[PDB]
Amino acid sequence: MDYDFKVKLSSERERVEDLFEYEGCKVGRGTYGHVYKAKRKDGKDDKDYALKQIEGTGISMSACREIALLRELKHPNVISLQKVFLSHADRKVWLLFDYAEHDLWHIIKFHRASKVQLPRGMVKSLLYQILDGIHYLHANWVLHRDLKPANILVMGEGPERGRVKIADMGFATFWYRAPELLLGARHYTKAIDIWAIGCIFAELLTSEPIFHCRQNPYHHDQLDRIFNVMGFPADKDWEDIKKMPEHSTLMKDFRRNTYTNCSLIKYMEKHKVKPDSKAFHLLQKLLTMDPIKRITSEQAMQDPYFLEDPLPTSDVFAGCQIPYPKREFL
Amino acid sequence: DKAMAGNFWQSSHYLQWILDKQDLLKERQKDLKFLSEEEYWKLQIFFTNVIQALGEHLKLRQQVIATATVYFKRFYARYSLKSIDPVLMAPTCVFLASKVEEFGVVSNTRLIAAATSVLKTRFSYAFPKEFPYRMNHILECEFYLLELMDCCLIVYHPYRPLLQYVQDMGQEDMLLPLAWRIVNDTYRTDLCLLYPPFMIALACLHVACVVQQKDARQWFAELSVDMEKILEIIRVILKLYEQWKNFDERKEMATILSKMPKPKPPP
Ligand SMILES: Cc1ccc(-n2nc(C(C)(C)C)cc2NC(=O)NCCN2CCN(C(=O)Nc3cc(C(C)(C)C)nn3-c3ccc(C)cc3)CC2)cc1
Structure with a gap:
């Protein structure tokens, strides 16, 4: 794998912990994983988001089905996926939703x-x-x-x-x-x-x-x-x-x-x-x-x-x- | 019926992954310093064949193989062939595609054994060394692939519209086997990145009709479609068969693969 390509992508890759404040703001734990009430740190938005860390690591069938489906769906009465973060160091998948x-x-x-x-x-x-x-x-x-x-x-x-x-x-x-x-x-x-x-x-x-x-x-x-x-x-x-x-x-x-x-x-x-x-x-x-x-x-x-x-x-x-x-x- | 089946016009496929030909050709200039245009096309035929062979070995339906092939195409539509080894990306695409299309997580052992055995038995003319990658390499590559694709996993293909078109004609037994194989053959070109699948289906059906000398002029006239676009696709199909004729993959691919730009390691 090309070094220049790797460092470039790493430099530009948005990280969940850099973009969002969710420390001590957990609002659910389950078999799905963990859900936090998050706000943007860089304060353009100033709006509440639901931030889900998917249970497990990598692209499990669960993570894959949720991403595949919610990426396509668009309706006012269905919860909406706003952003997906792939954390390379620990292989955790994070999903950002409407709060x-x-x-x-x-x-x-x-x-x-x-x-x-x-x-x-x-x-x-x-x-x-x-x-x-x-x-x-x-x-x-x-x-x-x-x-x-x-x-x-x-x-x-x-x-x-x-x-x-x-x-x-x-x-x-x-x-x-x-x-x-x-x-x-x-x-x-x-x-x-x-x-x-x-x-x-x-x-x-x-x-x-x-x-x-x-x-x-x-x-x-x-x-x-x-x-x-x-x-x-x-x-x-x-x-x-x-x-x-x-x-x-x-x-x-x-x-x-x-x-x-x-x-x-x-x-x-x-x-x-x-x-x-x-x-x-x-x-x-x-x-x-x-x-x-x-x-x-x-x-x-x-x-x-x-x-x-x-x-x-x-x-x-x-x-x-x-x-x-x-x-x-x- | 399957998830998101009627949603092409509101889909991520349509809205993000139907590309401008000129934008595609611009991003390809990076690799055209190393490879000729002909050699780059030959390489993409080769890796289409590698993905088909991997899928066949794993006993996956054509739709999983097609999705894997689109994923691969989308990656190198944006990035150089030197960014990630396409020998690694190919089985990564099949692995991800298999999860998306609901045929499961191909086990560690079976994916690696499949990559190893296919390269060794069906592609030794291209590859002197055994498949060097292990599952931790696949899992890293899968994260890069998902990111490039902007997590756009659901992919539409020409097989469904094709089947619907021939059923409407009343010519399923006569035309479907040939048209279906012509749709397989279009994946050795850029067509899936440039046109809606239903348009690719109509082009393959037209070429099937001409080959078998079936008159379908009335039926095609009665469709509500841009017939100039369909003719562009047919031209690409006819050109692909002349390239196929003139290309001996088995004689040429070792040299073409050596001319391919390769990953720079750490300092
Ligand atoms: C493996 C997989 C999992 C989920 C999905 N789908 N599927 C859908 C469709 C409706 C489109 C079919 C949607 C989602 N995902 C989703 O809504 N995720 C959004 C966030 N999650 C986080 C966890 N979560 C809850 O915590 N719900 C819940 C239950 C409860 C009590 C205590 C009442 C039992 N509280 N909460 C809750 C906690 C906190 C928040 C912010 C919201 C709800 C479910 C919502 C697909 C595949």
Whole structure:
């Protein structure tokens, strides 16, 4: 390898520690790696960024998939990769993103703790932007595969105030898993993401996870809870349920009779959501047990729910004060 | 269907990695002090063949080999052949491409054994010494490659549009094998850096139609496309077959490789 080429590139190579201040500003640690709240040192920008050090070293499959994909994607409702740093000395890969101050996990928990349920305008706006982001991913044949409140980010004060940013920790709590996965489906589908979105919408409406459950693809108690809420599917409701590899296990463990008084209508009534509402009718189309009977993200965006007063807003907080706490440093 | 399939016009491929021919030719003058234009083209055919052979040995689908080939081309579109040994870069491109196209991390042992065995068994006319690089060299080179490419990993190729074009004609059995091989042959030129893939597909399909004496004049007239551009690509294809004829890779490549500029070591 040519010496002149090497020293030249080394001299011009931007380093994360030279460009950004993130010492003691860690805001997450996980299997994904580490995430810091960073600000530019050379103070042109003066704006917050999320800085991810990818777990491991080198170009792992994980680092490669995240870089390859996020390099191409461009939508207001999907988290955006701004810059990639390759640290030659230690082979660490750093990724710089939009900083989203908030997320649905903390937002829902804040409201669930206050016992003030979610404002109805905010819920509609959250759901619309989520759908809009997923529709963009799905049109590009990008499945999310782990949609849940923790992965719906929401921007704080700034130029994108109250805008949803879909993110991922890279997992790849079964509360958002579609029944087909629980019954051993082998492939992820657009329908699986739609189920999860239905689950998030119910949670936004009630403040409680709809398929809440205590902590091999088959999980008995998670199916039990789904049937406690939805009822047990009739042959007519999901004809291909018999083709699922765990179908016989389901028949062994469960009796239709156990869930005769159970339905989504009855569940939502107990949490003071009206079954006559356009909200409930959209929710029921998202939470359909048979995946081929679930509406697509585009059809959900076209629902009359979003034409009803109040209209979705770009800022989910509709110009109001944000009561939710900022992220704490670790 | 595959990720980002319909996104070419909003892609990093289109927006950053379709180059101006004059900009490409300007950056090539560095190496043209050492090599003639003909010799530089001969070298790029040779390394296209090396990448194809590596991919074949590893049992990789043509699409992984094509992506590896584009990565290699993009590197030396910007930099001199002396910056990093292309004997090292070739297997690095296959290795990175294999991760991107979701066929996995080729193991330490298998990548190095593949580089060693291909050079030794299929390319001994070019190389007297055994493959000298080890996995730590590949991993360093992969970091340089990813940087040059500005982390632009997803690459579009003419195979998909080609398949769609012949299906529309109703001539898949008759024309596809020949047109497909003509698309393989275009990777021994600069075409992938200069034109959208769908345009390269139409050019290969046109040449397949002329070779097999199929009249597709009506069908080509009915496309909404710049036919002057398609004719430029066809000319490059026809020229590549006259170069192929006149070139004996096996007689010439040892001398051409010795004329290639080589890395300056530390002081
Ligand atoms: C291997 C791989 C990993 C991720 C990806 N995708 N895929 C997507 C699509 C949506 C396009 C499909 C996006 C990303 N990446 C991404 O959003 N990365 C941005 C930054 N990361 C950092 C870590 N992280 C979190 O920490 N999330 C999270 C969860 C939680 C609690 C405590 C609620 C469970 N907090 N946070 C969090 C912490 C700090 C910040 C700044 C934001 C969120 C996920 C977001 C692809 C491949």
